[PDB]
């Protein structure tokens, strides 16, 4: 039955990325912003290799990102959709049923502005999934998800439009 309870779409995780191009104080302040927003200690990502054009070097701490799950993820997601005034594009949804957008100022989310911190843009990605994804993530007897149980672009688009009364553009 296509109308089964366990086929319900719901958020798996939200990942917040700030890729400041350098290392040091600015990356530390981006990490402070992320720890402020999520309430969790974020994790810093190192450059996989050296590019002179971008001014980065291998193993230099470049970006910072954090993963949030549960009610807090929902709150942050709607707080970020408010900044987007609930209007994404069709191009924002991947073929695997996940979607993301990017804000440009972190004070638009609704947190206090500090002159010392400044303003950072931010990258939002939401990983969608139904119940039973633990099969692909557990240690013992790991398997794959059936085709009907897979998350795709159309189901995620329809679910977002229904659950948020928003518009998904396509320009």
């Amino acid at each position: 039955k296509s109308q089964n309870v366990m086929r319900e779409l719901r958020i798996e995780k939200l990942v917040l990325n700030i890729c400041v191009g350098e290392s040091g104080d600015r990356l530390t302040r981006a990490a402070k912003v992320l720890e402020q927003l999520s309430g969790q200690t974020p994790v810093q990502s190192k450059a996989r290799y050296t590019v002179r054009t971008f001014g980065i070097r291998r193993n230099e701490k470049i970006a910072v990102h954090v993963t949030v799950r549960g009610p807090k993820a929902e709150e942050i997601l709607e707080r970020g959709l408010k900044v987007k005034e609930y209007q994404l594009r069709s191009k924002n949804f991947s073929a695997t049923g996940n979607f993301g957008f990017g804000i440009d100022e972190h004070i638009d989310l609704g947190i206090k502005y500090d002159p010392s911190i400044g303003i950072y843009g931010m990258d939002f990605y939401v990983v969608m999934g139904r119940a039973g994804a633990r099969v692909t993530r557990r240690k013992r007897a790991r398997s794959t998800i059936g085709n009907s149980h897979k998350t795709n672009k159309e189901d995620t688009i329809q679910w977002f439009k229904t659950r948020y009364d928003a518009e998904v553009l396509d320009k």
Binding site: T41, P42, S45, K46, R48, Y49
Partner: peptide, 23 residues
């Protein structure tokens, strides 16, 4: 605090293929 650990093995990379200019 906490930092990402190297899942990959391209230790002596320092660059990458496919990254071709004019492309």
């Amino acid at each position: 605090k906490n930092t990402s650990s190297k899942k990959s093995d391209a230790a002596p990379a320092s660059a990458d293929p496919a990254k071709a200019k004019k492309k």
